[PDB]
Design a protein around this ligand. Structure first.
Ligand SMILES: [Fe+3]
Length: 254
């Protein structure tokens, strides 16, 4: 009766494909839903069309589409819903709900906290610099700032500075330029990313460059598919499947 359709954005890097597929597969045992299919927007199969049609072929009357996204931008608002309407037009009797990106969640703040703790340096009254990819969509900066504020409330750090690799300000290179000082305050750098790659490597090199000026700077590993990220995503899945007020009804559009 009920189905879950997981939708990742997809990758062409084999390791990223494998990690995303394995994560979504391991999610299934935590959800009491008989029909569950994984799919990806781009670059990686099963396609969204394939997964939706598989759900229908297994007899699903209700499909909960849950996007595996850290933040809310064009993928969550447009590309994925567009693919959903394209495939769903062929099955008008099937009810669809559509979930939210992870966004501002206490579990993800805990994931950031454990990445900080992994460095093994005291974090009390330390500065945190939270680097997101960035986007021209203001919701992305808004959500990263919200995550910084939640971290500020939950962990006794001096401050959390959200900044970005591209598209919106402040740029992380500007923050870095202002941190060449070394005033005795410890600064942790947390990359808010699901995968490694070119930008993560750039962050690594720039942190080396910064450490040449200020030795009290420590880069954590990127967040990745941390257990607390898994908790937050399972929260998204469960709330989308319950859809108790119809707030996740998939209405034609975005
Ligand atoms: Fe924990």
């Amino acid at each position: 009766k009920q189905a879950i359709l997981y939708v990742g954005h997809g990758s062409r890097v084999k390791k990223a494909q494998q990690e995303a597929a394995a994560f979504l597969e391991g999610c299934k045992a935590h959800i009491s839903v008989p029909v569950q299919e994984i799919s990806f927007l781009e670059l990686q199969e099963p396609t969204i069309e394939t997964g939706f049609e598989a759900c229908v072929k297994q007899g699903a009357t209700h499909i909960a589409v849950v996007p595996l996204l850290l933040l809310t931008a064009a993928h969550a608002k447009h590309d994925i819903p567009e693919e959903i309407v394209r495939v769903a037009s062929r099955y008008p009797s099937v009810r669809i709900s559509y979930g939210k990106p992870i966004g501002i969640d206490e579990e993800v703040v805990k994931a950031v906290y454990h990445r900080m703790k992994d460095i093994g340096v005291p974090y009390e009254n330390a500065r945190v610099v939270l680097i997101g990819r960035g986007s021209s969509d203001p919701d992305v900066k808004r959500d990263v700032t919200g995550i910084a504020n939640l971290l500020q409330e939950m962990v006794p750090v001096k401050e959390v500075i959200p900044c970005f690799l591209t598209a919106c300000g402040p740029n992380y290179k500007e923050v870095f330029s202002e941190l060449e000082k070394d005033d005795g305050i410890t600064t942790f750098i947390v990359p808010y990313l699901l995968f490694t790659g070119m930008l993560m490597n750039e962050i690594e090199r720039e942190v080396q460059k910064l450490k040449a000026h200020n030795p009290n700077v420590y880069l954590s590993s990127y967040i990745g598919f941390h257990p607390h990220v898994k908790n937050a995503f399972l929260n998204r899945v469960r709330e989308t499947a319950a859809n108790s007020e119809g707030q996740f009804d998939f209405d034609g559009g975005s």
